[PDB]
Amino acid sequence: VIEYSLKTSNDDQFIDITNLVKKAVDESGVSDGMAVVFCPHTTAGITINENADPDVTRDILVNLDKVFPKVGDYKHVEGNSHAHIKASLMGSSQQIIIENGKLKLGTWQGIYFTEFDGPRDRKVFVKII
Amino acid sequence: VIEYSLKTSNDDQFIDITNLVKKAVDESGVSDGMAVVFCPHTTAGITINENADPDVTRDILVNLDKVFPKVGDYKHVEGNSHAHIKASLMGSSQQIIIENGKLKLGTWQGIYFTEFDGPRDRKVFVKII
Amino acid sequence: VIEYSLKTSNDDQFIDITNLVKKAVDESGVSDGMAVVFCPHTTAGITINENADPDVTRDILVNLDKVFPKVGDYKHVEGNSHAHIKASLMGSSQQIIIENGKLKLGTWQGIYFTEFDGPRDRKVFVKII
Numbered sequence: 001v002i003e004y005s006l007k008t009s010n011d012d013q014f015i016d017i018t019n020l021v022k023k024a025v026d027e028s029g030v031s032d033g034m035a036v037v038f039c040p041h042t043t044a045g046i047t048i049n050e051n052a053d054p055d056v057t058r059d060i061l062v063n064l065d066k067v068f069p070k071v072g073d074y075k076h077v078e079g080n081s082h083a084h085i086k087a088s089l090m091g092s093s094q095q096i097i098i099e100n101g102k103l104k105l106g107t108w109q110g111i112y113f114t115e116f117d118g119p120r121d122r123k124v125f126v127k128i129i
Numbered sequence: 130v131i132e133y134s135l136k137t138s139n140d141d142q143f144i145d146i147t148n149l150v151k152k153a154v155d156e157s158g159v160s161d162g163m164a165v166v167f168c169p170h171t172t173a174g175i176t177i178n179e180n181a182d183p184d185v186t187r188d189i190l191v192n193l194d195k196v197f198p199k200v201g202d203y204k205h206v207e208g209n210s211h212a213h214i215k216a217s218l219m220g221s222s223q224q225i226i227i228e229n230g231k232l233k234l235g236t237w238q239g240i241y242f243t244e245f246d247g248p249r250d251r252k253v254f255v256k257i258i
Numbered sequence: 259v260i261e262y263s264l265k266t267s268n269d270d271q272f273i274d275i276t277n278l279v280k281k282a283v284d285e286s287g288v289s290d291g292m293a294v295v296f297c298p299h300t301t302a303g304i305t306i307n308e309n310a311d312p313d314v315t316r317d318i319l320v321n322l323d324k325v326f327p328k329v330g331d332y333k334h335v336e337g338n339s340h341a342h343i344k345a346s347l348m349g350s351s352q353q354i355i356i357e358n359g360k361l362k363l364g365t366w367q368g369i370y371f372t373e374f375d376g377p378r379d380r381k382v383f384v385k386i387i
């Protein structure tokens with residue numbers, strides 16, 4: 001697979017895609033398996049983290065920016081190497097256990113698309129196995 | 130799936146859970162497949178790294194702390210954003226190949242639960258496919 | 259699974275192994291599934307990132323080095339804790355969707371072995387499921 005389109009709206013942004021993943025699980029009919037969530041963009045990634053406090057996602061974005069700023073020792077002419085770095089640090093995919101037809105997530109644990117070079121028209125892939 | 134309970138004992142800690150994963154493999158009877166190890170906590174994660182030198186795990190913890198300290202530019206009122214960041218950096222899960230009924234790990238390569246907000250009663254999930 | 263041998267040539271290096279993964283897919287005959295790429299070395303890892311601009315891979319290596327330098331607050335007697343840290347940050351494995359017998363990768367998105375303690379004789383494992 002299911003491809004979802006996402007429109008990102010800031011240069012960096014966490015977008016909670018947990019329900020997009022649940023919908024793919026529900027469509028699949030799979031009761032027990034794995035959900036794989038993959039980002040095909042080299043300046044974005046996927047992570048799993050706190051999903052009910054905006055201050056946590058702000059703290060992550062702000063502090064990743066502090067450590068790998070937009071301006072620095074970067075040769076890359078497009079000027080988005082900071083985004084490439086942060087993308088690799090978050091990861092290109094994550095996976096979640098499906099048990100009893102539900103994503104086996106912890107308390108206030110959600111699945112995020114992590115944009116580091118928005119605003120852009122983005123895709124995310126969800127495969128249920 | 131197998132849920133294991135872990136009691137962590139320091140604010141940050143690497144706990145070698147390789148044998149908990151081997152036990153799940155052995156229980157499953159699977160000779161060839163994958164072991165998926167998932168952390169349902171947003172202030173802890175899973176990584177794979179050196180498992181026979183305490184100085185390496187100390188170096189990792191200490192240097193992750195140096196870069197993302199407990200005190201800093203953090204809005205989050207609980208005061209554990211450092212842990213949320215480090216958790217995303219390690220990852221919410223890892224996976225290991227099962228070959229000939231054994232985890233296909235390299236020399237002195239082990240699977241760790243990475244606590245960043247202990248001491249706490251924690252869980253880790255192991256799914257064998 | 260397929261084990262590939264790689265000879266790395268610098269202390270840090272990104273090696274594009276995308277075609278090694280495609281060959282494993284092609285050998286498997288699998289049309290739809292997953293490719294899992296695993297690094298058995300604790301001082302190297304796997305990441306997915308830009309594969310057509312050398313400046314991006316240079317920016318990543320250089321800036322990871324800047325943040326976690328070779329010399330610092332490290333007890334580990336071999337002197338490669340920087341590599342252990344960076345390895346955990348990239349990850350021990352990545353996975354890619356196989357669709358229509360092809361790796362489902364984005365534009366200029368490639369799979370890299372990330373060496374942090376070369377030059378060495380290394381292995382990478384590719385499992386197709």
Ligand code: NA
Pocket residue numbers: 088089090091217218219220346347348349
């Ligand atoms: Na990471």
